[PDB]
Amino acid sequence: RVKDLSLAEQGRKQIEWAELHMPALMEIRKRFNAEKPLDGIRIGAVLHVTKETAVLVETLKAGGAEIALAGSNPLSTQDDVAAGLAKNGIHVYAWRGETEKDYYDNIREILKYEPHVIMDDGGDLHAYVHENNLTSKIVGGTEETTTGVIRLKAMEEEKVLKYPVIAVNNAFTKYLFDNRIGTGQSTIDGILRATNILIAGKVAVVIGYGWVGRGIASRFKGMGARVIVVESSPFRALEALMDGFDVMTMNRASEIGDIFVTATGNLNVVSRDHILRMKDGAVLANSGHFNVEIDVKGLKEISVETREVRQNLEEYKLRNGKRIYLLADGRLVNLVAAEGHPSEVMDLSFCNQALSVEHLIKNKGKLENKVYNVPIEIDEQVARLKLKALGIEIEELTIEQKEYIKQWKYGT
């Protein structure tokens, strides 16, 4: 079930472009097409349907797996890529422009094949599978994003998890590169595609200085902006301060910011009261998963006029007469107003993704009520695969250097 099966030829060129820029995932595909480690394994995945998800899902099929795919976000599907995937053997039930009903119809669709492994992005598939008492034949799962692992850890503290799950988000090759480097470029890209706004002179307010937010602040600063950071963590506010960024409350930032981007995993982090004090022409965007970081509800009630300027650009006139610009319906603007993270960075996360599924199948003595970090050996193999593909040589410790480091005394 896709939007237009006629775009598969244009979409196929997009997956090959992504393949040529995912050398590490292509190297794993070769061991997969040779040892077929996922033979007879049925995978249910709710992921962002991109050209990069296509390289991972088709790499898993090369390992002998049967995959059912559903979009992780109702506006994230690249329609051409979904067409190209259907023309192959991928049971893809997703298209851009879904409604909330279509979203869960597509999730029930991927679930009729009765999967052994559950691959999820924001936590919805793990929640639905548990809330409707499936889980029976499920051997394990993986979680791709920060918000999904928090839901999964809450599930695990409640003794509700029924299969072991790998938090691929917690791998060094993921959150240090996907969340930071990838979202830094992608979020700015989405802002520029939805609006051709000048970054140079503007006061940009980044709410959240976690891995996503510090990458956004870095690239706003690299684009010439005056960066303001709002944080609730004492540690991360001091990090942003010592990195040269003005740190303050949203109450103060509400009056100065020209662009506000949210990168929390939290609710109404930009609230209706905040928006009332904002300047005329202020642009709002969200980079966390789920459209609840900005009070989009409040903005619609305090508003007396809405209109679309263009794709992903919505204008709201408040009673005070001032105009507020919402980007991408408050959904993660990188994947909705643009294409998400580059193919080169998703190479790393989808290498942990692919290898963590092989690890889940190869094992079955794991705890069905436990959230796992990626095994450091898999984490390290991904890094060596990327360096190998990039032609970067690293120093090898000498024997005298390995000896000196085990030592605590001296050497007369």
Added chain:
Amino acid sequence: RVKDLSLAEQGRKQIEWAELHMPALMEIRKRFNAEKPLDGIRIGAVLHVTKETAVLVETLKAGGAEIALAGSNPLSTQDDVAAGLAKNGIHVYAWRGETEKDYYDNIREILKYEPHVIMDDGGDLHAYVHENNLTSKIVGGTEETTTGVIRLKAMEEEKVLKYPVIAVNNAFTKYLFDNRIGTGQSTIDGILRATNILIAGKVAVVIGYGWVGRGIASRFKGMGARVIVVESSPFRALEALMDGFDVMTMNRASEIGDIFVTATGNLNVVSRDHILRMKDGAVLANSGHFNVEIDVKGLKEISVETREVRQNLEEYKLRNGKRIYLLADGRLVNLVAAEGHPSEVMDLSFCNQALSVEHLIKNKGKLENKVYNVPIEIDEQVARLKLKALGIEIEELTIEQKEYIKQWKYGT
């Protein structure tokens, strides 16, 4: 003569978007709509048909002028903006996808109105009127880009220039922001729209360290890239070196680079021989005017296979089998793969444009053989308008301070 007038409503929404972010040009429109300084003046323009050129030409029409507009590059025209301009009173002969005959047909159309003022971007319109012996009724003109000013300075050395022309490119409020800050964002934006390539880990080669090239290198570096500069000027190469960038010849850079962007006003700075030595997957883009900085004709002859991967992304197979990616067919990647400079920066550039046409009509005792710089009084009013629009106060010198600096003797 445009592509589809059915887009006039969407394009109008784009021009209104530009209007709100070009506040300094809007305040000039107010004094223009009241004093009608260009009443009875007919203007012929070769500019990039964008939402920002739309705000400039309609600002000119408010001053009482009749305007004929033709596209400056055959792929830069925004079709909806061209439609919206047709719904108003602008005689626009341009559309995306033109041919060289269509380009010069649209220029001959512009010349039927017997223009009083000639507004040009790349110098193509000024050259035509002189080479085809029109210019009879022309009172003056303006030049927007570095390439056009060089030609007009060459035209003036041969005493073929027939009217005074203002080098709007040379105004401080233009080349310091349009050429540097504007192209820096725009070119990265165009690169990211034609390819979703990660800039962070890459070796980016910028050929040309003028105002355009240093803005591009700054933004490559701000996006995380390893920047290499190729320069032919000893001064600007030493500047690029002291700005922390690796400086070398194209022969050395060609074997190392992942992305090559050209920003000269010159010919074959990325040559046939350079591409033969480049890595597999190297991306080529041009930011200067005219498609001759990269030898695109040579690339077609050393190629055995060509293919379009996506809009504005052409793939070439070489005899060695290595693939070379060309962006926007070697045309300005900012204006062809994206939307050009933000409206906020073109506000500064088009304030000189509008004020320089008013300056040409108020005067008539200028040299019909001279390229002029923008009058410094106008140059300083543009910056004061932006600051007044942005809410930035500057310090005013006290009288003891103004006197101290006219003094040179012993004692203060």
Added chain:
Amino acid sequence: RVKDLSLAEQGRKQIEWAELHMPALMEIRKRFNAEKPLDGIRIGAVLHVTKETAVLVETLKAGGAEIALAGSNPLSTQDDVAAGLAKNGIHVYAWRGETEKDYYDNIREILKYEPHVIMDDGGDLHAYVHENNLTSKIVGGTEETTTGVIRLKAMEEEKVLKYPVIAVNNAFTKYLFDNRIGTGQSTIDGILRATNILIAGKVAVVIGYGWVGRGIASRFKGMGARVIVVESSPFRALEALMDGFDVMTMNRASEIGDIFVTATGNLNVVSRDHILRMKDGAVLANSGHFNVEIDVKGLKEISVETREVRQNLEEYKLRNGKRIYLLADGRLVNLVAAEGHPSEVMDLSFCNQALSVEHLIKNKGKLENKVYNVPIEIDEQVARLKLKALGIEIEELTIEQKEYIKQWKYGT
């Protein structure tokens, strides 16, 4: 025992300057002078004898402790600060220019008072006390730097450690600001004081991309240098690559670098054979603790001439005829060629020291052979104290926000 007790007035002005720039440590001092949590406690300390160490030990004296202090490095001691510290009640055995025999004689001196708590900087005091069986009355200790933590953990896996030790280096408020921010500024400052070298156009090689090396690379880049990273960890090599730095082996960097700075906890990281490959004029510096990161013993044997150019700058002429400049005899150049970390950054590290030393006395039911990280409560109190002192307001999470974070169930 200090060099000249007559400088006690000059040192006092230096210690008072630090007090004004360690505001968070002063509020701990006020709560110490009132609650005297360290009554009847004798402390033996091996630390860098600086104005900031003076503010910490006197904060310890105010809490009712008796302190014996010995220098952590034979060239780090500020003699006036030691004089000023002796004029009060601090048993300080240290001066600049010490011999290695003086170093270990001074350690027996502070160890004569039979301390209950051991404060060590590079691990030397923890080792001596253990190899010579003086742990009998020692109730606990603290460790300040990464190299000391590695030694203590080796003692811990080797099960010889005899008291609990708090790894103060591993606190977020320590390694994120002290190791990263402080050493970045301090090392560049030391390089500039021993040489007024131009950083801008130069190739600077940072060996080690941990917290110290990334801070050094950040400040080299900010001072205009072209930064090259050498690393042995695949994770950290990819971290350096994605941050825009060329990553290679020492074998390649040795022939291209102008400045070499070491930031490993390791031995012979810049070897005898690397220096023979270096260019005429290359500068060598070390920022990790202990002067064994640069093969300075090897450099002296392959050299034919050595001479002092100025304070902390020794020039060596090689058999090749080329000149190699060594800074501060390969000892930590930040603390030897300059004054170490600013007072504002050591405020954070020495707040952890005081609060974690008080924590060692508050308890006594802790495990022998156990290295602990700083309790997360104290780590956060240090962070909140700095924010309060800097006047920085942090955002407060609402009740609806704390609820949405525990949920994993469907419905928004």
Added chain:
Amino acid sequence: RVKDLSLAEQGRKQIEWAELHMPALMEIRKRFNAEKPLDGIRIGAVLHVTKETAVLVETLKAGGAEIALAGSNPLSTQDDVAAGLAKNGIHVYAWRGETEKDYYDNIREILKYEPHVIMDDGGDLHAYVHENNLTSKIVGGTEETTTGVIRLKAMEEEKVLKYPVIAVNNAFTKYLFDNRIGTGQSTIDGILRATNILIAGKVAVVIGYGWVGRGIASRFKGMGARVIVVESSPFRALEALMDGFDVMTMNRASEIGDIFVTATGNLNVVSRDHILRMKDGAVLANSGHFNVEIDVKGLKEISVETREVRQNLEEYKLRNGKRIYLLADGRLVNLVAAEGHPSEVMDLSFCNQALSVEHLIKNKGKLENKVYNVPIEIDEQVARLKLKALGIEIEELTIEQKEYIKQWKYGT
């Protein structure tokens, strides 16, 4: 006449250090010692007596010139370098700690040899020579700094100037590197030597966004500070805003800034009323020539108690009780609290110096009443000499490329 002739050995090691780091000036010295272009010429110079002036002054002696040297600033002289110069053949009258009477006594000393050439830094020697009716035997002169060029240009408008003067400050290889890159590092180095202040977390105010101030802002930003710019020109305030810096008046910046550095050529730019509004602990420093940018005379009259904390750091207690720290007594902090610009950058400025003196001797048909910019041929030789010494290759323009640049017509 110097302070201590016994320091001549330490100074010579410092001049040798500069010679090894001024390769381009070392290349001119050999052409000078061979072609003796300045034989029989007497030169009187008022410059900062540094290891870098020593390399230039001895380079002039190598060309056959007789040189008398006096310090340009009473606290800038490097005493060991002055001793080393006196042991050679340099009539040097300078020492650190001069009084204003000593300053002009020393200028009369160097003026007793009746020089044909005047080398000046801040304009004082040009002013004295004109105000006391000498100039009789003077054949020409040079000006090194911006402040001197303004005074000399007023002398030209007043028709008082009696010999031709070369504005060495206005050459690209000077103001693009000395004023910007050199002073940027130099000023931060001086601040760090007078105080070990953390730059990272601080608000730094740069008053003046010319070539000096923008270099200082670049280095504050590179050291992690939050940079605020105060400007009086609309053009440069817009330059500072688009470079990402908060721009405001001194009245607003005075209440926010932690460090204030002045880089104007102007008077009372930091006023007494401004200082009373400042935070407690604010640091003041000056980078423009002459100690009048900060109202230091006003600050001494508003204070109730003053004391020196360390070299170049005085603490002032204000009537409101707040503490204000002044650096280098309001004088160039780069040259008084540190060692001025690195030798690699002064290589460029003193190469223009050396080459422009010979150009003054080669000629005598220049208007003996006019200020000239450095001849473009010499500016270009300086750039190529530096590029060759650094091993940097620049691209050579093709014969086809040289033609395409003079063409203007349609096609070819």
